[PDB]
Design a protein around this nucleic acid. Structure first.
Ligand SMILES: Nc1ccn([C@H]2C[C@H](O)[C@@H](COP(=O)(O)OP(=O)(O)OP(=O)(O)O)O2)c(=O)n1
Ligand SMILES: [Ca+2]
Ligand SMILES: [Ca+2]
Length: 341
DNA sequence: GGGGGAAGGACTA
DNA sequence: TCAGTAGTCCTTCCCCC
């Protein structure tokens, strides 16, 4: 198999640059303003001029401003990036019917039946980059290898605005030399459990007793890592279908007062129903983020679709279940719909 | 023994 | 006054065949 992975460069910030070119060359920071106070919230992403200085996705907006007080701070306009993303995905469909859209800014193409070798895949990759640049003026990074995991890794190594092929020989070198923390799906917590087992490279998972590996990181991740280490990882490129749609909002102030929380919960339901658009969910979950940032949730599944009115009344019962079963105050409240008809 | 669901947890956004 | 904001898949514990 030959997989071609496309990951758009600093996506949210780049789309803003495309819509307002005077922004180019300046540090741009796209933010999610929570509304609790002046500048409360987090950075969604920043272009490379801002990232060079430590302003990156996830940090508080107040911290970003301490580092770069004169950078351009823009409010996230998700719907705008979504429309731009959808047009780029449509361009990629022209290069392969076998495409897997993994997120708002990334897709995997199985080009096995389109090119004969890596030389040709690499060329098709250039063709793709040029096409996206021509049509939307957006630069992307392309990663090419024998499977999804290594195609993604290839891209990670070449961004931004890059293109890289990890051939079979390099795949073998990487299995031995690549820091296992850099493997998709290995976060800080798993990375720490592995370091604690002596495991720092994929190749290391082949010599550890399987039960020891599994007992520590679970059966699924152990098999995943082993399959990659044996160079036998095979997952087909598959059309993704959204399985849930939801919205969670931050409250002006923490609380466990039902009438005070209702307005935020109802606003989350409205926005959520706006996004479902024709999709009818049979399940609804109320999700609360507690004062200490823990996540607690309660849901219900119906043998039929959930009308907006039913979503309103059931969400309150589920919220009450959360209040009655957890004594912490709530900071964020939202809903999540799933099991679509 | 293991299918199947609810809720927590990890990961990547 | 650090802490957003969406969404997926796996795990653990429980019911049930
Ligand atoms: N914690 C995060 C991480 C990402 N995103 C959003 C904004 C990013 O623009 C977009 C894509 O994610 P990437 O990790 O690919 O980040 P970028 O495209 O921004 O940059 P790059 O790919 O250059 O590294 O997803 C977000 O809202 N919150
Ligand atoms: Ca990406
Ligand atoms: Ca990207």
């Amino acid at each position: 198999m030959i997989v071609l992975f496309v990951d758009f460069d600093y996506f949210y910030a780049q789309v803003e640059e495309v819509l307002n070119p005077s922004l180019k060359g300046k540090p741009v920071v796209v933010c999610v303003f929570s509304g609790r106070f002046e500048d409360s919230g987090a950075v969604a992403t920043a272009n490379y001029e801002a990232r060079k200085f430590g302003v990156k996705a996830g940090i508080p907006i107040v911290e970003a401003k301490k580092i770069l007080p004169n950078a351009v701070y823009l409010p996230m306009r998700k719907e705008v990036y979504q429309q731009v993303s959808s047009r780029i995905m449509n361009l990629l469909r022209e290069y392969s019917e076998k495409i897997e859209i993994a997120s708002i800014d990334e897709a995997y193409l199985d080009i096995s039946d389109k090119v004969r070798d890596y030389r040709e895949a690499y060329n098709l990759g250039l063709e793709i980059k040029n096409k996206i640049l021509e049509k939307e003026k957006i630069t992307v990074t392309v990663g090419i290898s024998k499977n999804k995991v290594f195609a993604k890794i290839a891209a990670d190594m070449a961004k931004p605005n890059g293109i890289k092929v990890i051939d079979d020989e390099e795949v073998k070198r990487l299995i031995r030399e690549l820091d296992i923390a850099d493997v998709p799906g290995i976060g800080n917590i798993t990375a720490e459990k592995l370091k604690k087992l002596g495991i720092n490279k994929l190749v290391d998972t082949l010599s550890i007793e399987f039960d020891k590996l599994k007992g520590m990181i679970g059966e699924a991740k152990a098999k995943y890592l082993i399959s990659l280490a044996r160079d036998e990882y095979n997952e087909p490129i598959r059309t993704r279908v959204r399985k849930s749609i939801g919205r969670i909002v931050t409250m002006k102030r923490n609380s466990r007062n039902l009438e005070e929380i209702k307005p935020y919960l109802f606003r989350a339901i409205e926005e959520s129903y706006y996004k479902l658009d024709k999709r009818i969910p049979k399940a609804i979950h109320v999700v609360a983020v507690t004062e200490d940032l823990d996540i607690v949730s309660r849901g219900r599944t119906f043998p039929h679709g959930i009308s907006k009115e039913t979503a309103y009344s059931e969400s309150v019962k589920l919220l009450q279940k959360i209040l009655e079963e957890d004594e912490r105050k709530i900071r964020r409240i939202g809903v999540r719909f799933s099991k679509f008809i």
